[PDB]
Structures are given as structure tokens and as C-alpha cells.
Amino acid sequence: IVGGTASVRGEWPWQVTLHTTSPTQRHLCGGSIIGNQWILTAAHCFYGVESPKILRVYSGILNQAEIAEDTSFFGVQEIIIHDQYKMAESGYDIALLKLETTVNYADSQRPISLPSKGDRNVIYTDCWVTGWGYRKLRDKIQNTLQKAKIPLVTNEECQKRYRGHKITHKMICAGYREGGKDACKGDSGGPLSCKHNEVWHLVGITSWGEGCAQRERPGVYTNVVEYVDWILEKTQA
Ligand SMILES: *[C@](=O)([C]([C][C][C][N][C]([N])[N])[N]C(=O)[C]([N]C(=O)[C][C][C]([C])[C])[C]([C])[C])C1=N[C]=[C]S1
């Protein structure tokens, strides 16, 4: 997260850190708890990943330092990538991680509500992006989960900043005209939480962006409301 600040412990209970154990353990991507055995994240976060056996999901984490060899984690039973996903910039950057065990909810770890199809008219004005990603283009994974409030921008506005790409209605962008605040490397798979009517909704999933926090270069996210049917279908045993 560029231009953000340290999060308060338990402030973003749906946020999880996805680690890979190969060659040695490290933070791979962010993710969101949406069900007792389900993590919603980015599909492009599994590039090179031949098996779910090298994955570990940690919930209720604030500082990466809390993670050690003796720290409990959730195993991943299955990685579910959207069948139309090819690459982040082309859309469909969404994936589900079915955990080997169930998450026992508590104040430090609970699921975030998915947006409703009826809410596609809502004008979320209180949106936050979170993660342990870079605080600058050339950086490293942060110890403390960061947060940054960022305004949504119209898809038409976003397309203007990415005349090289196709910003579809299945994507949603957020950023400042002058930049300064944005998600960055390591935040991928992270949630783009927006508080509407006193309730947090998983509006987007951190996907891609040209550089990080550059002026006239909004962060691009998977537009979650467009995948509620997919999520339900893939979550229904
Ligand atoms: C993800 O953590 C990052 C998320 C960066 C989001 N950036 C932003 N909001 N400004 N994703 C990537 O790095 C992504 N590629 C790009 O963003 C480059 C896009 C330009 C247009 C070429 C992936 C597809 C590689 C991570 N994802 C993988 C490792 S960290």
C-alpha cells in the first residue's frame, strides 16, 4: 500500500495473508474471508503455483512478525481459478481458495459481506484498500498491515487513463487524480472494502495498475458484484 498508514489490529478482520512455502516461506498475496472455508482472492496470484500444498493462509494477522514456524495456519484444499482468466489486465482476475479446515470466527477474523446486485447503483464514498504490499514501486513486503482510503473513479474515467487497455464493466478503479495513495506489489488479492450503510462490502479485489500511485493511473480491481453468481456456483458443493 502506497501512501497509507498502519492498521489497528482487528480493523480489517476479513483480510488474510497468503503465504507460499517454496523455496522458503514468504507473503505471496492478500485475500478475503467470505465464508468459513472460503477465501476470495486474485487468480493471477497463482502464477507458477503447481499445487495448493505450498500454500498457507493466515487469518487474524496484523504484523507479519506474528507469523513463525509454530504459528497455526489454514491449509488450502483447492484453488479455484475462473475459467475465463488469462491475465489480470484482461479481466476475470478472481479465484477461490477452499480451505482444508474451517475458520472459527472471532473479533480478529470474520467474513466480509459480498456486494448485492441491487447495489450496482450505490456510490460508495468510503472505500479502503489494505495489504502488506510495497510502500513504493521498488520496495519489500511490509510487516504491519497498511490501509489507505481511496476514491472510486468511473470506468469511463479509468479507460481514459488506460487507453492501452480495455477497462470492462467487470473491473472497477480507484485512485487520486494526482496519485499518492494506491495498492502496490504484494497487495494483490487484497480486498477493496467500502463501508455503506454501516456495513463493509467487498467491492473489489486488488488486481493491477501501471506502476504504483502514479498520477492519472488509478489502481484497477476486479469488480466483485459481477461475480456473485460465479462465487455462489463455485462455493456450492
Ligand atoms: C499484486 O500485488 C500486484 C498489485 C498491484 C496493483 N497496482 C496498483 N493498484 N497500482 N499486481 C501486479 O503486480 C500485477 N501487474 C501489474 O500491476 C502491472 C500492470 C501494468 C499495466 C503492466 C500482476 C499481474 C503481476 C501482485 N501480483 C503478483 C505479485 S504481487
Task: Give structural attributes.
Thrombin, subunit H, 2 domains, Coagulation factor XIa light chain, eight-stranded antiparallel beta sheet, mainly beta, 14 strands, 32% strand, binds ligand 995, 2 helices, 6% helix, 237 residues, monomer, globular
Task: Tell me what the structure shows.
The chain has helices at 155-161, 228-235; strands spanning 5-6, 15-20, 26-35, 38-41, 55-59, 74-81, 95-99, 127-131, 146-149, 152-153, 171-174, 191-196, 199-208, 219-223. The protein has 237 residues and is mainly β. It has 2 domains: 1-12 and 112-226, Thrombin, subunit H; 13-111 and 227-237, Trypsin-like serine proteases (Thrombin, subunit H, Beta Barrel). The strands form 2 sheets. Strands 1-9-8-12-13-14-11-10 form an 8-stranded antiparallel β-sheet. A 6-stranded antiparallel β-barrel has the order 2-3-4-7-6-5. The ligand *[C@](=O)([C]([C][C][C][N][C]([N])[N])[N]C(=O)[C]([N]C(=O)[C][C][C]([C])[C])[C]([C])[C])C1=N[C]=[C]S1 is lined by residues 44-45, 88-89, 133, 182-188, 206, 208-210, 212, 219. Glycans are attached at residues 63, 104.
Question: How would you concisely characterize the structure shown here?
Answer:
The protein is mainly beta and 237 residues long. The protein is 6% helix and 32% strand.
Please give the structural blueprint:
Layout: E1 5-6, E2 15-20, E3 26-35, E4 38-41, E5 55-59, E6 74-81, E7 95-99, E8 127-131, E9 146-149, E10 152-153, H1 155-161, E11 171-174, E12 191-196, E13 199-208, E14 219-223, H2 228-235
Antiparallel strand pairs: 1-9, 2-3, 2-5, 3-4, 4-7, 5-6, 6-7, 8-9, 8-12, 10-11, 11-14, 12-13, 13-14
